[PDB]
Each structure stands twice: as C-alpha cells, then as structure tokens.
Amino acid sequence: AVKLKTDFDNPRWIKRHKHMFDFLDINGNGKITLDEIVSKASDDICAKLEATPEQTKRHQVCVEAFFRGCGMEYGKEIAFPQFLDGWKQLATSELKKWARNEPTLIREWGDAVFDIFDDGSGTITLDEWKAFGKISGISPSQEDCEATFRHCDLDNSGDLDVDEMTRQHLGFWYTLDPEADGLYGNGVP
Ligand SMILES: O=C1N2C=C(c3ccc(O)cc3)N=C(Cc3ccccc3)C2=N[C@@]1(Cc1ccc(O)cc1)OO
Structure with missing residues (x-):
C-alpha cells in the first residue's frame, strides 16, 4: 500500500534530496x-x-x-x-x-x-541495473544495486519491473515511505 501522505519537513526527506x-x-x-x-x-x-x-x-x-x-x-x-x-x-x-x-x-x-534495456519486456536485470547505477552515478556500488534487488519484489526470473520500481520511487522520492527505505542500498540516504 503506497504511502501517499507527504513528509516534507522531515530531515531525512530533505537530506535525500540534498544528497541528490x-x-x-x-x-x-x-x-x-x-x-x-x-x-x-x-x-x-x-x-x-x-x-x-x-x-x-x-x-x-x-x-x-x-x-x-x-x-x-x-x-x-x-x-x-x-x-x-x-x-x-x-x-x-x-x-x-x-x-x-x-x-x-x-x-x-x-x-x-x-x-x-528491453528481450521482453518492461524488465531490467540485475546486471543491467548495475550498469545503470554506474553510468548514471546514482548507485555505482554493485553491492548497493544488489541491495536494491533484494529490497524490491522481483519477477519470476529475478528481474525488476517498472511497476515495482515506480511504486518504490513514489515512496522514496515523494513520501519518505518507510517501505521504500533502503531502495538504493547505502548509496542514497
Ligand atoms: O529515479 C531515478 N533518478 C532520480 C533522480 C533524482 C534527482 C534529483 C533528486 O532530488 C531526486 C532524484 N536522479 C537520477 C539520475 C539522473 C538525473 C538526471 C538525469 C538522468 C539521470 C535518477 N535516475 C533514476 C531513473 C529512473 C526513473 C524511473 C525508474 O523506474 C528507473 C530509473 O533511477 O535511479
């Protein structure tokens, strides 16, 4: 259940965006x-x-x-x-x-x-995410990418789908949802 109430004065939300x-x-x-x-x-x-x-x-x-x-x-x-x-x-x-x-x-x-990153479809593999983490720079530690994959609910093949990453990102960037904490491992507070 994605958290929809905002927490904009929480120093953890402020710090997350200052880090970025x-x-x-x-x-x-x-x-x-x-x-x-x-x-x-x-x-x-x-x-x-x-x-x-x-x-x-x-x-x-x-x-x-x-x-x-x-x-x-x-x-x-x-x-x-x-x-x-x-x-x-x-x-x-x-x-x-x-x-x-x-x-x-x-x-x-x-x-x-x-x-x-699309075979089929609307999924990303762990190796693809590790490449993205390095190239974007948001998560250059492969261990942090591994943590992302452990944190999220993956599909049957162990891959991440955009529905899941979207739900996580809503909580991570917008609402400081406790269910999203740790989405980027130790790479983003
Ligand atoms: O979410 C993401 N980002 C959020 C912020 C960001 C920036 C400033 C903030 O205050 C907060 C967040 N910066 C970058 C990196 C980037 C920035 C600008 C241009 C390209 C890439 C970034 N990359 C994403 C891209 C993404 C989006 C949706 C997905 O399903 C998967 C991947 O995944 O991590």
Missing part, C-alpha cells in the same frame, strides 16, 4: 540548470547505454518534463532551497495523478529508462 542535488551539482558551486541535467541524460547516459536516437529523445522529453516539474528550466540556475520547494510541488502533483491512476512523470521516465 549535490550529486547533480558536479562543479560544487551550489547551482544546477536544466541544461546540465539534460546533458547528463542524453550526452552521458543515453550515449553510454547505446540508446537509439528515438529512445534518447523519449528519455530526454521525460527528463525535461520531470525536472520542469520541480521548477527547473534551461538557462535558469537553481539553488537548493528553490529546488526543494520545486520538489514539494512535484510530489504534490504526482501523488494526485497516482491517486487518479493518471500516469505520473516518474512512471513515464521509468518507461523511457526500461525501454533502453
């Missing part, structure tokens, strides 16, 4: 732009994963929509306090879509990531 903001803030100057985030998505990640041009474009559209949802825009430098305010708005919007069974931006981003 600093991870996005490559030069350490306390500011990030949508340009930087889309370059990470397309020039770095999709290139290394050998995504097709169509896949790369779809993933880029999803990343653009997701981070515009938390107030970022091309040419706009955003610092952490405003980024966190944006995340509150994003979470509020996403949870209302989820409750109405309207596709969320986090689900659509997930569909784009999973499609790059």
Whole structure:
C-alpha cells in the first residue's frame, strides 16, 4: 500500500534530496540548470547505454518534463532551497495523478529508462541495473544495486519491473515511505 501522505519537513526527506542535488551539482558551486541535467541524460547516459536516437529523445522529453516539474528550466540556475520547494510541488502533483491512476512523470521516465534495456519486456536485470547505477552515478556500488534487488519484489526470473520500481520511487522520492527505505542500498540516504 503506497504511502501517499507527504513528509516534507522531515530531515531525512530533505537530506535525500540534498544528497541528490549535490550529486547533480558536479562543479560544487551550489547551482544546477536544466541544461546540465539534460546533458547528463542524453550526452552521458543515453550515449553510454547505446540508446537509439528515438529512445534518447523519449528519455530526454521525460527528463525535461520531470525536472520542469520541480521548477527547473534551461538557462535558469537553481539553488537548493528553490529546488526543494520545486520538489514539494512535484510530489504534490504526482501523488494526485497516482491517486487518479493518471500516469505520473516518474512512471513515464521509468518507461523511457526500461525501454533502453528491453528481450521482453518492461524488465531490467540485475546486471543491467548495475550498469545503470554506474553510468548514471546514482548507485555505482554493485553491492548497493544488489541491495536494491533484494529490497524490491522481483519477477519470476529475478528481474525488476517498472511497476515495482515506480511504486518504490513514489515512496522514496515523494513520501519518505518507510517501505521504500533502503531502495538504493547505502548509496542514497
Ligand atoms: O529515479 C531515478 N533518478 C532520480 C533522480 C533524482 C534527482 C534529483 C533528486 O532530488 C531526486 C532524484 N536522479 C537520477 C539520475 C539522473 C538525473 C538526471 C538525469 C538522468 C539521470 C535518477 N535516475 C533514476 C531513473 C529512473 C526513473 C524511473 C525508474 O523506474 C528507473 C530509473 O533511477 O535511479
């Protein structure tokens, strides 16, 4: 049962997003732009994963929509306090879509990531997730990727499906659901 009540003043939720903001803030100057985030998505990640041009474009559209949802825009430098305010708005919007069974931006981003790794179908193997964790940088420890797979409910083949990862991500990024704690092992607090 996905937790839908927000916990935006909990220091653990704040710290999770500050950890991610600093991870996005490559030069350490306390500011990030949508340009930087889309370059990470397309020039770095999709290139290394050998995504097709169509896949790369779809993933880029999803990343653009997701981070515009938390107030970022091309040419706009955003610092952490405003980024966190944006995340509150994003979470509020996403949870209302989820409750109405309207596709969320986090689900659509997930569909784009999973499609790059697609035999059949809408699943990711542990080896594929370990590669993603290194290439995205969100989880470069293969042990942390292993923990993700232990944490989640996997399919019959031991693979992860986008429905499961979506439910986990709602709890991890938006509501600080205790059921999502540990989703990224020790890699993301
Ligand atoms: O969830 C994810 N992420 C969340 C944040 C992030 C960033 C800032 C925050 O404050 C909080 C979270 N940053 C990145 C890494 C990334 C960022 C920008 C562009 C491309 C990749 C990231 N990669 C994902 C991609 C994903 C999405 C849905 C799935 O089903 C599977 C995989 O899996 O971990």
